[PDB]
């Protein structure tokens, strides 16, 4: 996605 | 010129040349002005791709090494793992120093400060996964410290439903679970983040309904998975 | 290092999804000078396919941008210089492959199947260089592509069964070369039709290697559907 | 995507 991806969430 | 460099980073993104895209944003950052959020977004997209490729490669190779019954085939895998790790250390040290010299000290809004603090915890956490036994505890602490600072700011200046505050609580709780190995602490952190956000769904903008609630679902997913 | 280590390193790089390592490894295995077994041939082919496909795909995105811009000349010059850098990375990769073909793979290949494979590969790598060549250079790169597919084509007519995947794959790539690079859709269609038909007749020539031959024949017929309407 | 990929088919 877009705003989730660059949020770089924990795997 | 900044505008020239950002236009370049954007071309590199279209082309999926993330190494190119990271070099551009490196430079833009190094010019020394506070980044817009479009730039903060590009910086992050690029380092996420560049470091994540190595981090995935490291996994494949590291789990072939420690799934080996043949001493010469395994010296090979060991040599490759460590060539990949040194790539990874370079990338993290680049980011970490960009964060130390420009991004954190220039961040003039809480939301921004908290994001870059989270990023520093997240880049130290990556270094902790790949750390000899000797340096590990010290690196783990650097990671813990950046997240705690981000956590203390976010609690004080952001709504419990702010996607950045949620994302921080997600990544910090994972750090407690996988890196510090304190499942009790991972769980309470994530439970309470989730609850504080349910308790205030009034404070949700028409703009970010979806994004907040999605992260709240991922927080819950870990709860259920960490509960069983 | 040892020809074995090199191969083992490649299959690691491949597992890691590090295709530039994998192509470095396989390049040097080939430069050792000995005919490459099927497993080596295939590892070589995989590595360079990924390594070039990325540049090609990158080139397609950037070139179509430099073309769809008609506002500020500044943006358009930025996109050109980038398309140029990429084309450069790309000529380099093809030129390595083309020379590994001239110096080692084609003259060492002892079996027609393998000769055909590497001639096809030569045709593909000149095709790539052609999509990206200038007005001057280009009539001639195209010709080197055609001569190689032609030679591949003739060996495979004389020496392989019409249902062999490598023969069909050649027909498929050579037909696309006629349609897209040379603008001869009459030549493209008949080559693809003929190939499909010959495979259809000697259908008893199939084997453990059929699902592949029929998938390929499906792709040939798909092009026919598309090109005639 | 194994034997077909190797074969590097035209796009």
Tell the burial category of C68 from Cβ atoms under 10 Å away from its Cβ (0-12, 13-18, 19+). Answer: exposed
Which residues, including other chains, have CB under 8 Å from residue B164's CB and lie 6 or more apart?
A: A7, B111, B114, B115, B118, B154, B158
Q: What is the rounded distance in angstroms from the CA atom of residue B48 to the CA atom of residue C192?
A: 45
Nearest partner of B117 among B164, B179, B54, B162, judged by Cα: B164
Q: What is the rounded distance in angstroms from the CA atom of residue B15 to the CA atom of residue A6?
A: 17
What is the C-alpha R_g of chain D?
A: 6
3-state DSSP assignment of residue B205 = coil
Tokens of C120: 């096809």
C172 near D CB under 8 A:
yes
Tokens of B209: 């309904």
Are 3 or more Cβ–Cβ pairs between B and A shorter than 8 Å?
A: yes
Q: What is the rounded distance in angstroms from the CA atom of residue B99 to the CA atom of residue B120?
A: 7
Burial call B17-39: b when 16+ CB within 10 Å, e when fewer: bbebbbbbbbebbeeeeebeeeb
Torsion angle of the four alpha carbons B76, B81, B83, B85, in this order, in degrees rounded to the nearest 10: -170
Q: Which of B5, B6, B11 to mutate to test the interface with C (most CBs of C within 10 A)?
A: B11
Count of the separate structural domains present in chain C: 1
CA-nearest residue to C118 within chain D is D7
Q: In sequence order, which ranges of chain B are alpha helices (DSSP H)?
A: 2-15, 18-30, 37-65, 71-98, 104-106, 110-128, 133-157, 163-174, 183-198, 209-227
C54 near D CB under 8 A:
no
Torsion angle of the four alpha carbons C87, C93, C97, C102, in this order, in degrees rounded to the nearest 10: 60
Tell the burial category of C90 from Cβ atoms under 10 Å away from its Cβ (0-12, 13-18, 19+). Answer: buried
> What is the torsional sign of CA B26, B28, B30, B35?
negative
Tokens of B228: 């069983």
The Cα angle at residue C191 between residues C195 and C111, in degrees rounded to 5: 60
Q: What is the rounded distance in angstroms from the CA atom of residue C158 to the CA atom of residue C116?
A: 11
Structural domain harbouring C176: 1-229
3-state DSSP assignment of residue B131 = coil
Q: What is the rounded distance in angstroms from the CA atom of residue C110 to the CA atom of residue C150?
A: 19
Q: What is the rounded distance in angstroms from the CA atom of residue B216 to the CA atom of residue B213?
A: 5
Do C212 and D6 count as a contact with CB atoms less than 8 A apart? Answer: no
Q: How was this structure determined?
A: X-ray
CA C91 vs CA C48, C62, C84, C127: distances in Å: 13, 16, 10, 11
Q: How long a stretch of residues is chain D?
A: 11
Q: What is the rounded distance in angstroms from the CA atom of residue C38 to the CA atom of residue C31?
A: 16
Resolution in A: 2.3
C65 near B CB under 8 A:
yes
Q: What is the rounded distance in angstroms from the CA atom of residue B196 to the CA atom of residue C135?
A: 66
Q: How long a stretch of residues is chain C?
A: 229
- C78 to chain B, closest Cα gap in Å: 7
CA C85 vs CA C27, C33, C81, C131, C219: distances in Å: 23, 32, 6, 15, 34
Tokens of B163: 């996607």
What letter would DSSP give residue C203? G
Tokens of C71: 């506002």
Q: What is the rounded distance in angstroms from the CA atom of residue B1 to the CA atom of residue B225?
A: 48
Output the domain CATH number for residue C218. Answer: 1.20.190.20
CA B228 vs CA B217, B221, B222, B224, B225: distances in Å: 16, 11, 10, 6, 6
Do D3 and C165 count as a contact with CB atoms less than 8 A apart? Answer: yes
B55 near C CB under 8 A:
no
Tokens of B159: 């709504």
Question: Which chain B residues have a beta carbon less than 8 Å from that of C86?
Answer: 15
């Amino acid at each position: 996605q877009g705003x989730x991806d660059x949020l770089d969430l924990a795997x | 010129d900044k505008n020239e460099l950002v236009q370049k980073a954007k071309l590199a993104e279209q082309a999926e040349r993330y190494d190119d895209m990271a070099a551009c944003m490196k430079s833009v950052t190094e010019q020394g002005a506070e980044l817009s959020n479009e730039e903060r977004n590009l910086l992050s997209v690029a380092y996420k791709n560049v470091v994540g490729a190595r981090r995935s490669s490291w996994r494949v190779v590291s789990s072939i090494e420690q799934k080996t019954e043949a001493e010469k085939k395994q010296q090979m895998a060991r040599e490759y793992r460590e060539k990949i790790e040194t790539e990874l250390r370079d990338i993290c040290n680049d980011v970490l120093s960009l964060l130390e010299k420009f991004l954190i000290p220039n961040a003039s809004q809480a939301e921004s400060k908290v994001f870059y603090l989270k990023m520093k915890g997240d880049y130290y956490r990556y270094l902790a996964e790949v750390a000899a036994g000797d340096d590990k505890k010290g690196i783990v602490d650097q990671s813990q410290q950046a997240y705690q600072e981000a956590f203390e700011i976010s609690k004080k200046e952001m709504q419990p439903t702010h996607p950045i505050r949620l994302g921080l609580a997600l990544n910090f709780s994972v750090f407690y679970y996988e890196i510090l190995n304190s499942p009790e602490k991972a769980c309470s952190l994530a439970k309470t983040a989730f609850d504080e956000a349910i308790a205030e769904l009034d404070t949700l903008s028409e703009e970010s309904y979806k994004d907040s609630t999605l992260i709240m679902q991922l927080l819950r997913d870990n709860l259920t998975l960490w509960t069983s």
